[PDB]
Amino acid sequence: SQDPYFKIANWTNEHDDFKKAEMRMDEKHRKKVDKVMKEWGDLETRYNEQKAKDPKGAEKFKSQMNARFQKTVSSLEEEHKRMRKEIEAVHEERVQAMLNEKKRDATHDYRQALATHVNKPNKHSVLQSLKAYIRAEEKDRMHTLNRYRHLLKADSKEAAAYKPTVIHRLRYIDLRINGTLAMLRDFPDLEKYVRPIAVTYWKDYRDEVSPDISVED
Ligand SMILES: O=S(=O)(O)OC[C@H]1O[C@H](O)[C@H](OS(=O)(=O)O)[C@@H](OS(=O)(=O)O)[C@@H]1OS(=O)(=O)O
């Protein structure tokens, strides 16, 4: 069989399932590296013994066993990297998919909040609906930027083939949010009191979730 992780269906707690699967993978990997490193040790002690006894046959053993070892390592290193990338692609797909859903639904509550307003003062509801939408888009930025961060440290290469993309995402997020704020222009009664609150909340919420940094670049 495979990991139970790949066939889930609520995705509601993806972070926890992923973080969990990642340990089961990470740990399973540590199981193998230990087994190899131990094999190396037994192999290596042997060389030290037959060192002065069979210096010719002994030495051949060292060259030989290095090739094997070197190879077995590279083999493992790849497998892990392969599996790691398989679990992430999946993860990043559900997270994006699930984030989108929040956007999708947060918008609905928003546009209803506004339609209901036309008739009667959905005042407070409109805002809490907007702030919800904002939290959703901003969470999309925070996770994206963060992915660029991990890739900047893992693959300074894979990383570069993402920047144009990251820049494209962060742009439309701002656009979508600004366009979603524009929808208030029509309710003058309401754009006068709700807007300045929601914009401050956007600047505030972004300051908390995805700050600035001074350490490095
Ligand atoms: O898999 S879940 O158990 O649903 O994830 C819960 C939270 O896990 C981390 O705190 C998550 O933090 S993270 O840095 O690892 O994304 C956090 O994301 S965040 O609130 O948007 O910041 C998650 O909160 S959630 O409401 O977005 O699901």
Which candidate, 149, 114, 154, places its Cα nearest to that of 133? Answer: 114
Q: Is 13 in the pocket of ligand 1 (CB under 6 A)?
A: yes
Ligand 1 centroid vs 15 CA: distance in angstroms? 6
Q: Is 15 in the pocket of ligand 1 (CB under 6 A)?
A: yes
Ligand 1 centroid vs 18 CA: distance in angstroms? 12
Rounded CA gap, 40 and 73, in Å? 11
CB contact at 8 A, 169 and 140: yes
Count of alpha carbons within 13 angstroms of residue 190, beta-carbon side: 24
3-class secondary structure, 161: coil
Rounded CA gap, 77 and 80, in Å? 5
Question: Could you tell me the domains of the chain?
Answer: 3-211 (1.20.120.770)
- Cβ neighbours of residue 117 closer than 8 Å, sequence gap 6 or more: 123, 125, 126, 187, 190
How many other CB atoms are found less than 10 A from the CB of residue 207?
10
Nearest-atom index, ligand 1, CA of 143: 16
- Report resolution in angstroms: 2.8
Ligand 1 centroid vs 216 CA: distance in angstroms? 25
Nearest-atom index, ligand 1, CA of 19: 1
Rounded CA gap, 164 and 185, in Å? 32
Which of 15, 139, 141 should be mutated for ligand 1, with most atoms under 8 A from CB? 15
